[PDB]
Amino acid sequence: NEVKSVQPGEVCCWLCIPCQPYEYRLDEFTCADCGLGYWPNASLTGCFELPQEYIRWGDAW
Amino acid sequence: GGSYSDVSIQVANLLRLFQIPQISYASTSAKLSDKSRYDYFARTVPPDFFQAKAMAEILRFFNWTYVSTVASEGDYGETGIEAFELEARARNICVATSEKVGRAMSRAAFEGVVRALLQKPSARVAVLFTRSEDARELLAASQRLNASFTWVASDGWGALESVVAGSEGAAEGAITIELASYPISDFASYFQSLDPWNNSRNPWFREFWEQRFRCSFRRDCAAHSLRAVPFEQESKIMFVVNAVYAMAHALHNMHRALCPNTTRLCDAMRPVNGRRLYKDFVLNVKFDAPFRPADTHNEVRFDRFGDGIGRYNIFTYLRAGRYRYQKVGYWAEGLTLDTSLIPWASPSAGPLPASRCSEPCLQNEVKSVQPGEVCCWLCIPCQPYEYRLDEFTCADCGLGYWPNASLTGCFELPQEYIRWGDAW
Ligand SMILES: *[C@@H]1O[C@H](CO)[C@@H](O)[C@H](O)[C@H]1NC(C)=O
Ligand SMILES: N[C@@H](CCC(=O)O)C(=O)O
């Protein structure tokens, strides 16, 4: 879930930066956000549509 | 003898076996100062230990902290670049890339060296510590590929017109270093009177005449003369004369010590020994430098390592529409230079050329460097409720507090209530 931002002057060394919960990691160095109503896949490379929620009969309310 | 440091070192290794003294006039490598190995060598020029200081201080003056270096393979270039890298670290200057030039390099190799410099576009300043031919070829390669750098060169480039012939566009604006010297006036009238018909003792003069005036003795060579064309004296004429006079004075003092009653050679001096002349007489000479201008006080002498004194002049290359070299300052235990003479350093020309790894951080951001990185950094923004305490610290403003516009202080938030005028 983290992305790499390389420090200039040292290829080996890098900075790990965590991504927001709703963003997904498209490439090694950057992560993009899924669209509204979509949530990042467990791979953090895609988007799975969010289920539509409503009140149900079996709820305690 | 000895103009290139490599030649001087190779010759010195052989001469120490037979105890023959040697005085150089243009070799400035630092390796020759080790008297455990070269125990019969002296020179009238300073070592390259001070040229690195002068170059590094020139870079510091202009705030150029990311730089690339190019060196020539051999003793001179390698030792000079090592000294410069040591001196540069001391001043928080970092080297983006390092290149080397071999003894046999083709044009494609020079173009590859030029392309390798362009990989790091942040470092726009190239530091050359190289021989003259390598500098000429590198300038030609840069002209071919339409590349632009700011050159800082050592005395190998010096102030030769041959290096920048036909590559004026690429060489414009460069800064070079030369040994401090003056021109002697008898040599000008001596040289300008020479012609191949009377200067028969020099076997190499006719070839030079043909190359210079573009003629062939086999005829049309007698129309030309060296007086009609202008004469530009080379920089290190003074040092050759000084070396010859130093050797003459050493022999004169030795003769005065060993043959007191005669002016002709005596039997004691017949093989002129050789360990004695260097250990006693060569290193103890002191006299007025000949043919010097009357105001000056230059003297000829050697220190414990048989070296000279370190003073340098600094030049820039500019366009007047002819091109010319212009002196802008000097270095003798400290840099002095006039920025009015440099064109790109003048006001109304524009911003100064820049060479740095990282642009400064913003007002609200903080620098983050891996431990021990003095040149490069990363900007990390502070939290909205935190104020920049110093470079690497974002300090929490406090509860009920907001950071100041300066982001270096805190002010209390106004309270809220249900005012008499609300819709509620
Ligand atoms: C170099 O930077 C220092 C500090 O900002 C500044 O005082 C000086 O004027 C600068 N020199 C040049 C020539 O840019
Ligand atoms: N000092 C240079 C020689 C350059 C010159 O001849 O002026 C060297 O050690 O190679």
Side-chain angles (χ1 to χ4, degrees), chain A residues 1-3 5-42 44-48 50-52 54-61, chain B residues 1-231 233-278 280-310 312-321 323-338 340-345 347 349-361 363-366 368-369 371-405 409-411 413-414 417 420-424:
Chain A
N1 51 37
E2 293 177 350
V3 296
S5 178
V6 291
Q7 178 170 182
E10 301 155 326
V11 187
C12 312
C13 313
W14 55 64
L15 197 59
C16 294
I17 303 301
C19 294
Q20 295 295 100
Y22 57 92
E23 301 154 348
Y24 79 99
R25 205 178 57 101
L26 62 84
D27 62 353
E28 210 284 332
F29 311 104
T30 299
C31 63
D33 50 357
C34 279
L36 292 96
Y38 301 104
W39 205 249
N41 189 23
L44 289 155
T45 59
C47 302
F48 77 72
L50 284 169
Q52 310 174 355
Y54 53 93
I55 182 167
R56 263 145 183 77
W57 297 90
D59 297 2
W61 293 93
Chain B
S3 287
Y4 295 96
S5 297
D6 304 68
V7 171
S8 296
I9 287 158
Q10 293 293 109
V11 168
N13 282 337
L14 178 73
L15 286 186
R16 70 175 292 276
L17 297 179
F18 304 92
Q19 293 105 45
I20 304 181
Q22 179 186 346
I23 308 185
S24 176
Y25 51 81
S27 298
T28 54
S29 177
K31 286 174 67 175
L32 292 152
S33 305
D34 190 8
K35 299 290 104 176
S36 68
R37 316 181 52 183
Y38 318 103
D39 47 324
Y40 284 84
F41 180 79
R43 54 184 161 193
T44 65
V45 294
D48 269 345
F49 166 72
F50 304 108
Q51 190 150 241
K53 288 161 149 49
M55 282 165 78
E57 285 189 36
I58 287 158
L59 297 181
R60 184 72 262 182
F61 177 93
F62 277 113
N63 296 326
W64 296 333
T65 50
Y66 211 41
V67 286
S68 308
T69 69
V70 185
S72 285
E73 175 181 298
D75 304 304
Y76 164 76
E78 291 170 17
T79 59
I81 283 297
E82 182 176 18
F84 165 78
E85 269 133 8
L86 195 174
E87 289 305 319
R89 194 172 303 111
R91 292 166 176 78
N92 296 296
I93 294 180
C94 295
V95 172
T97 188
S98 299
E99 292 314 287
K100 275 175 51 50
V101 179
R103 313 162 94 259
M105 286 260 288
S106 51
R107 291 193 173 185
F110 282 116
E111 289 180 2
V113 171
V114 173
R115 279 197 279 270
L117 287 168
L118 277 167
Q119 295 306 311
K120 298 291 186 59
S122 290
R124 264 161 291 210
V125 165
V127 172
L128 313 179
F129 201 112
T130 58
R131 297 144 68 97
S132 50
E133 56 257 32
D134 299 2
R136 175 176 43 80
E137 293 296 330
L138 200 68
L139 264 291
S142 310
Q143 171 97 357
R144 280 201 298 275
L145 302 175
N146 200 356
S148 173
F149 306 89
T150 290
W151 304 108
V152 174
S154 66
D155 80 319
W157 181 334
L160 281 169
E161 301 276 60
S162 64
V163 173
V164 300
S167 315
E168 276 95 332
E172 192 181 10
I175 284 167
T176 64
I177 283 163
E178 188 65 73
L179 271 292
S181 63
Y182 50 78
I184 73 187
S185 188
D186 274 11
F187 181 60
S189 179
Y190 168 79
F191 196 88
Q192 289 196 298
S193 68
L194 300 174
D195 65 351
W197 289 270
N198 67 8
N199 192 18
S200 56
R201 77 174 165 186
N202 191 4
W204 298 289
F205 195 67
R206 295 182 88 92
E207 194 167 355
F208 155 79
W209 191 268
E210 289 185 334
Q211 184 183 254
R212 180 45 183 99
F213 290 117
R214 304 169 151 59
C215 78
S216 75
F217 296 119
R218 200 159 181 284
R219 301 201 173 180
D220 64 38
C221 281
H224 308 284
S225 175
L226 278 167
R227 290 206 183 86
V229 296
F231 179 67
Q233 198 186 105
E234 192 275 310
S235 308
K236 296 196 180 68
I237 299 307
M238 179 188 66
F239 298 113
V240 183
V241 173
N242 291 358
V244 172
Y245 263 75
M247 185 73 77
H249 264 287
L251 284 165
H252 178 76
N253 292 334
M254 181 144 169
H255 181 264
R256 291 261 59 66
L258 300 188
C259 316
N261 284 294
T262 179
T263 57
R264 334 311 291 285
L265 276 185
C266 71
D267 272 315
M269 191 146 198
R270 185 65 62 191
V272 177
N273 187 340
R275 180 192 38 87
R276 262 211 75 191
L277 184 62
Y278 179 80
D280 299 352
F281 297 106
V282 174
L283 295 166
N284 302 352
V285 292
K286 208 183 77 171
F287 54 98
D288 288 314
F291 307 118
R292 71 181 182 184
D295 62 283
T296 65
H297 265 291
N298 290 42
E299 274 200 341
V300 176
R301 36 177 179 80
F302 304 97
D303 64 358
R304 264 201 311 130
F305 316 109
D307 289 345
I309 193 64
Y312 304 92
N313 291 354
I314 301 150
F315 295 81
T316 194
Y317 197 64
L318 58 91
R319 181 178 182 177
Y323 291 75
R324 46 188 209 80
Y325 283 99
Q326 180 76 53
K327 191 190 156 181
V328 307
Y330 59 84
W331 191 95
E333 316 305 322
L335 178 73
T336 292
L337 61 84
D338 190 343
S340 170
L341 298 167
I342 309 163
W344 43 263
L352 276 171
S355 184
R356 62 179 67 98
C357 166
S358 296
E359 298 288 339
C361 285
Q363 188 196 34
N364 42 19
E365 289 177 332
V366 292
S368 164
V369 316
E373 191 62 41
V374 285
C375 295
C376 303
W377 57 74
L378 280 72
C379 301
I380 310 298
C382 294
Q383 299 279 349
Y385 56 91
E386 290 179 1
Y387 78 100
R388 173 190 172 99
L389 189 153
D390 58 78
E391 296 175 352
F392 309 92
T393 80
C394 300
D396 185 23
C397 183
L399 270 297
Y401 284 105
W402 197 256
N404 287 358
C410 280
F411 73 104
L413 287 169
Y417 45 89
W420 295 85
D422 288 24
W424 295 82

